[PDB]
Amino acid sequence: TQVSSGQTYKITNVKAGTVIDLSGEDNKSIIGYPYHSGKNQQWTFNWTGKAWTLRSASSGSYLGIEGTPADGTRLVAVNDPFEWHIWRDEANENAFRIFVPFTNYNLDLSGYGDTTPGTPVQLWWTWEGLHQTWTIDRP
Ligand SMILES: CO[C@@H]1O[C@H](CO)[C@@H](O[C@@H]2O[C@H](CO)[C@H](O)[C@H](O)[C@H]2O)[C@H](O)[C@H]1NC(C)=O
């Protein structure tokens, strides 16, 4: 399936198999969680003209970040559209990396893709670890 502006997707960690999930505990924290077709596990993509924004299908908040980009920066739901660069992974072209634009920081399921439900999604410097790679497909 092709990723296209206006469409809504789930985003699955290649290492863990859990998906990017807007925590039901606080409707703010971004975690890895097993997929149950929740709307808090579905993200509406928009191409702005220069980057992607990801809108929570349940809350209407956007996938964004907790502070300035760094190793360990938490992802959180934010009010305003937050722009991402999204590229195919170089080794596995069916998967993707999601970067803060013009940085080397990409989404990373913490604990090296810890499968535990509630594992935070964070930024980390880009490297080959598969917990930084994600499939994007229909809910
Ligand atoms: C009423 O308590 C909340 O119930 C929700 C439904 O079971 C639950 O939502 C899930 O949260 C997890 C993360 O903890 C994940 O986001 C799932 O996709 C959600 O369905 C809340 O966690 C419950 N707890 C609290 C404290 O609200």
Do residues 106 and 69 lie in contact, with contact meaning Cβ atoms separated by under 8 Å? Answer: no
Write b or e for each residue in 73-96: b if 16 or more Cβ atoms lie within 10 A of its Cβ, otherwise e: bbbbbeeebbbbebeebeeeeebb
Atom of ligand 1 nearest to the CA of 26: 27
The highest-level CATH class for domain 1-139 is mainly beta
Determination technique for this entry: X-ray
Q: Residue ranges of the domains in the chain?
A: 1-139
Amino acid at 83: E
Distance, in Å, from the CA atom of 122 to the CA atom of 75, rounded to the nearest integer, reads 5
Number of Cβ within 10 Å of residue 22's Cβ equals 27
Token pair for residue 17?
A: 């198999």
**Strand pairing class (119-125; 85-88):** unpaired
Q: Which residue has its alpha carbon closest to ligand 1 atom 19?
A: 24
In angstroms, this model's resolution equals 1.4
In 40-137, where does DSSP find H-type helix? 110-113
Please name which of 78, 53, 81 lies closest in space to residue 67, comparing C-alpha atoms: 78
Amino acid at 130: L
Q: Quick one: how many helices (H) and strands (E) in the chain?
A: 1, 12
**DSSP H or E stretch at residue 35:** none
Mutate to test the pocket of ligand 1, among 18, 22, 23, 58 (most ligand atoms within 8 A of CB): 23
Cα-to-chain-centroid distance, residue 99? 9
